[PDB]
């Protein structure tokens, strides 16, 4: 009745409308059009934009294009065909809009982890600098340096600039860094398939080894190019201190921001399972070791190509051995007593040891991290009953109600009630087995088996539809009070005008804190 229950919007926009929602708050109108269409239809051409919508031909497209490129909201690729001419295809780029969904959250960790300089002018300084970085989308050093006032200390803001290069965070602008992982692999696959001067028709399987191995070493140099390079940043001419290259520009990065929050999730698991002191000693280790830790960067070869059935491991364990290599080899050598209490107690998480050197595995750590958080979700959502039965399916696997009723807890009827509450949304599935009848009819045997990626994805439905109505009715709160807000802006009177002024601001503060909260929940669920 009256549809105000928001059943209208409920069914039809999974993923999708997420994107053009955020860019609408960002810009709106034309900007939401192109991206929203860039999502729905996927790969898109310049001329193709005009055809569909028909609105504002060639005036809007060229304007939106450069607008999307500065903030790099579009993945760009150009190539040609055997026939001739040229073509330029655009993709929805990475999860940039997620960075626009981040903003201050990134700047938060930027401010907090910038310690080693105690409570300094830095707070007002780089907050002005970083806000100028992300907003413009790209920053050249000299043109930015020109914005700084004269007859003052010029290297005060450059006191932390070369310190902005730091370890992680801001890196240089490089070339093709924005590029489809599938396409760059195919472009790098050239000079490989192309390589043989009619050599010899022996051992066709050697074409495999040739192309692959040569592509892997050529892939490593490309991905480690933005990762660590000291050339540009560490330049140190005389008559001064170390000063970043005035020519080469910079950009923010996924490295330590996605890492810092991942460490938080580990701390939350830590702090839960130990004291506050143990979490700190485990923390000071993570702060030094976070540089060479792939972690969030883990698959890196996954998107853009096949894995295998057979050779899947020969791919996977090839990564696992380099996930064996770098954690074992490079990381820190041997308060060690408080490490031993972090040692003797291992399960669930980490503290793997080699003779002479100890370090945390980045391979086997994730499964127990996914377990905990997920089990805490069901614990949070439903009562204590729904909790216990989840693992009851996870101890052994795929069994009937016979040994379940026995081994679980107490009562049949309530179990059946929470069984259908558990089986309500996916995640245990159901079994297809007959009893003697070969799919003929009821009374057949039943079992319950754990679900892979299905019991995950329902937390990926929690991604958008949480923030959706959250941000939307916050935006609807704007246009409703829009006549008031414009009056407030011009004023920057009456008893009742100040009332609704505090109203919206209240709702605004609480809705943004609610954005970041469940944001922190989603971030851990995006992997495995």
């Amino acid at each position: 009745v009256m549809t105000i229950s928001s059943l209208e919007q409920r069914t039809l926009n999974p993923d999708l409308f997420l994107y053009k929602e955020l860019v609408k708050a960002h810009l709106g109108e034309r900007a939401a059009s192109v991206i929203g269409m860039l999502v729905a239809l996927g790969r898109l051409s310049v001329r193709e934009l005009v055809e569909k919508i028909d609105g504002m031909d060639v005036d809007s497209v060229k304007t939106t294009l450069v607008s999307l490129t500065q903030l790099r909201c579009v993945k760009y690729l150009q190539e040609t065909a055997i026939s001739g001419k040229k073509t330029t295809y655009y993709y929805y780029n990475e999860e940039g809009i997620h960075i626009l969904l981040y903003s201050g959250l990134i700047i938060d960790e930027i401010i907090t982890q910038m310690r080693v300089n105690d409570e300094e002018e830095h707070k007002q300084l780089v907050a002005e600098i970083v806000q100028n970085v992300i907003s413009l989308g790209s920053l050249t050093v000299e043109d930015y340096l020109s914005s700084v006032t004269s007859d003052s200390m010029k290297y005060t803001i450059s006191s932390l600039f070369v310190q902005l290069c730091e370890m992680g965070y801001l890196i240089q602008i490089s070339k093709l860094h924005y590029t489809p992982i599938e396409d760059l692999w195919q472009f790098l696959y050239e000079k490989h398939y192309k390589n043989i001067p009619r050599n010899s028709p022996l051992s066709d399987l050697k074409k495999r080894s040739q192309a692959k191995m040569n592509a892997k070493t050529d892939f490593a140099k490309i991905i480690n190019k933005p990762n660590e390079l000291s050339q540009i940043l560490t330049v140190d001419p005389k008559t001064s201190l170390r000063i970043v290259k005035p020519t080469v520009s910079l950009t923010i990065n996924l490295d330590r921001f996605m890492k810092g929050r991942r460490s938080k999730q580990l701390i939350n698991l830590a702090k839960t399972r130990v004291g506050s002191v143990t979490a700190q000693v485990y923390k000071i280790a993570l702060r030094l070791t976070e540089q060479k830790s792939p972690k969030i960067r883990d698959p890196l070869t996954q998107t853009g190509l096949l894995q295998d059935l057979e050779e899947a491991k020969s791919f996977q364990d090839e990564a696992e051995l380099v996930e064996e290599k770098t954690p074992g080899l490079t990381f820190n050598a041997i308060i060690n007593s408080h490490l031993k209490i972090l040692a003797s107690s291992n399960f669930p998480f980490l503290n793997e040891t080699k003779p002479g050197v100890y370090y945390v595995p980045y391979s086997k750590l994730m499964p127990v991290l996914k377990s905990s958080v997920y089990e805490y979700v069901i614990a949070s959502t439903l009562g204590p009953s729904a909790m216990r039965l989840s693992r009851c399916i996870r101890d052994n696997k795929l069994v009937s109600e016979k040994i379940i009723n026995s081994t679980a807890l107490m009562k049949e009827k309530d179990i059946r009630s929470t069984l259908a509450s558990l089986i309500r949304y996916n995640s245990v599935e159901i079994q297809e087995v007959p009893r003697t009848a070969d799919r003929s009819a009821s009374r057949a045997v039943f079992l319950f088996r754990c679900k892979e990626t299905h019991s995950y994805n329902f937390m990926r439905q929690n991604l958008e539809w949480n923030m959706a109505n959250l941000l939307f009715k916050k935006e609807k709160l704007k246009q409703e009070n829009s006549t008031l807000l414009k009056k407030a802006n011009r004023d920057d009177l009456l008893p009742s005008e100040l009332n609704q002024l505090k109203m919206v601001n209240e709702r605004e503060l609480n809705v943004f804190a609610r954005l970041s909260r469940l944001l922190s929940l989603w971030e851990v669920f995006q992997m495995a």
């Binding site: 999974p14 130990v274 909790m387 989840s390 101890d395 807890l409 107490m410 539809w465 809705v511």
Partner: protein, 98 residues
């Protein structure tokens, strides 16, 4: 019959806090004979073991025994309280499909 399933809701209450523990079948061999109402056989060795096994209670460590960590906070992620707000919007975070 009905006498069953109601006997496991009592004797397991506070014995937890008084438990490092050792041998894990001794924990029952302890629990089996106690309270003078006792308990019968190894049928209960695998009972309180594999029933309460999940969601804190006692942790599972090698050489067959039980540890304790995060239940001490619950008996006292955690601490959630003060919900809900009375009216007008927010959350739900359930069903709705999507």
């Amino acid at each position: 019959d009905i006498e069953f399933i109601n006997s496991l809701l009592t004797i397991v209450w506070r014995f937890i806090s008084e438990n490092y523990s050792t041998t894990q079948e001794i924990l029952e061999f302890i629990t089996a004979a106690q309270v003078a109402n006792v308990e019968l056989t190894p049928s209960n060795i695998r009972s309180l073991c594999e029933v309460l096994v999940y969601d804190d209670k006692l942790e599972k460590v090698t050489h067959d025994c039980y540890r304790v960590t995060l239940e001490s906070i619950l008996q006292m992620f955690n601490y959630f309280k003060m919900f809900p707000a009375s009216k007008h919007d927010k959350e739900v975070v359930y069903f709705d499909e999507w």
